[PDB]
Amino acid sequence: FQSMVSAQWVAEALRAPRAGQPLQLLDASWYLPKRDARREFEERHIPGAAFFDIDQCSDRTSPYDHMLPGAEHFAEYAGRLGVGAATHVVIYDASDQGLYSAPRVWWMFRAFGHHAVSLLDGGLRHWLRQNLPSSGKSQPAPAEFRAQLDPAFIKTYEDIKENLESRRFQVVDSRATGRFRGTEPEPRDGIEPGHIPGTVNIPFTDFLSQEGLEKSPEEIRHLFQEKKVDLSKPLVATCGSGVTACHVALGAYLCGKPDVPIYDGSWVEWYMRARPED
Numbered sequence: 647f648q649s650m651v652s653a654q655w656v657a658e659a660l661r662a663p664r665a666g667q668p669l670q671l672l673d674a675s676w677y678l679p680k681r682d683a684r685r686e687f688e689e690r691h692i693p694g695a696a697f698f699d700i701d702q703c704s705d706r707t708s709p710y711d712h713m714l715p716g717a718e719h720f721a722e723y724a725g726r727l728g729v730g731a732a733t734h735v736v737i738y739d740a741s742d743q744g745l746y747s748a749p750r751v752w753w754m755f756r757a758f759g760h761h762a763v764s765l766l767d768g769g770l771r772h773w774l775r776q777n778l779p780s781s782g783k784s785q786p787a788p789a790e791f792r793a794q795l796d797p798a799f800i801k802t803y804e805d806i807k808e809n810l811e812s813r814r815f816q817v818v819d820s821r822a823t824g825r826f827r828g829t830e831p832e833p834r835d836g837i838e839p840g841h842i843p844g845t846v847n848i849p850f851t852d853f854l855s856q857e858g859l860e861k862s863p864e865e866i867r868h869l870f871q872e873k874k875v876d877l878s879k880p881l882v883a884t885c886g887s888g889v890t891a892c893h894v895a896l897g898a899y900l901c902g903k904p905d906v907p908i909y910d911g912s913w914v915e916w917y918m919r920a921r922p923e924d
């Protein structure tokens with residue numbers, strides 16, 4: 647329950663606060679090389695917001711980028727960012743779509759045991775149309791954050807591979823149609839486009855309005871039905887590198903289905919390890 651917060655909710659909760667129930671805004675902007683999320687933050691951001699670096703708060707040994715980090719690493723990261731036991735996290739991003747990389751971080755706090763995490767509707771795109779309540783860097787104090795990762799939130803290469811036979815869960819890919827069909831290139835050097843056999847293409851953009859807001863739960867229910875996805879049966883989301891897949895997990899969450907694991911490795915890992923030849 648209660649996973650998303652509006653542009654007006656956040657304006658009020660700051661001029662609150664409350665006692666034993668703190669707030670902490672986050673700019674989890676992340677882009678494919680095309681924009682500097684940290685420099686853009688320092689130029690323009692929401693008061694109190696600290697920048698959440700998706701590639702920094704990641705597994706330090708993997709050759710893949712923004713793989714879920716270890717429990718001790720996420721505790722040290724979230725802690726130093728102003729997140730504790732009673733903290734209420736609100737994540738946004740300055741993306742053109744409204745929300746893009748923000749649901750990835752929403753999913754991350756949930757996976758490590760901190761369910762007191764919400765998302766800002768429309769992100770910064772709509773924090774512009776609806777008023778203008780900043781510059782600088784940012785300075786929150788620590789933590790004593792505890793992290794216990796629930797592996798039920800993540801699917802591995804082997805799980806996806808073995809599902810090709812078992813069919814125990816539905817797989818939704820949130821990449822653009824072109825990339826999924828194999829008609830548009832992949833943004834990574836040497837990686838070819840295409841998709842995992844038996845997966846459904848539901849691009850992450852289908853979950854949002856042209857305004858950039860999240861579609862209604864009834865609209866998302868209609869989408870899942872039209873794409874031939876049964877929200878009563880198990881569902882796993884995938885994409886290019888495990889970022890926009892969390893939009894699918896969010897869509898299903900707002901429909902009453904919180905158990906939607908993410909294939910963290912996603913297309914880049916699949917292309918590397920399965921080596922599809924066409």
Ligand code: NA
């Ligand atoms: Na480091």
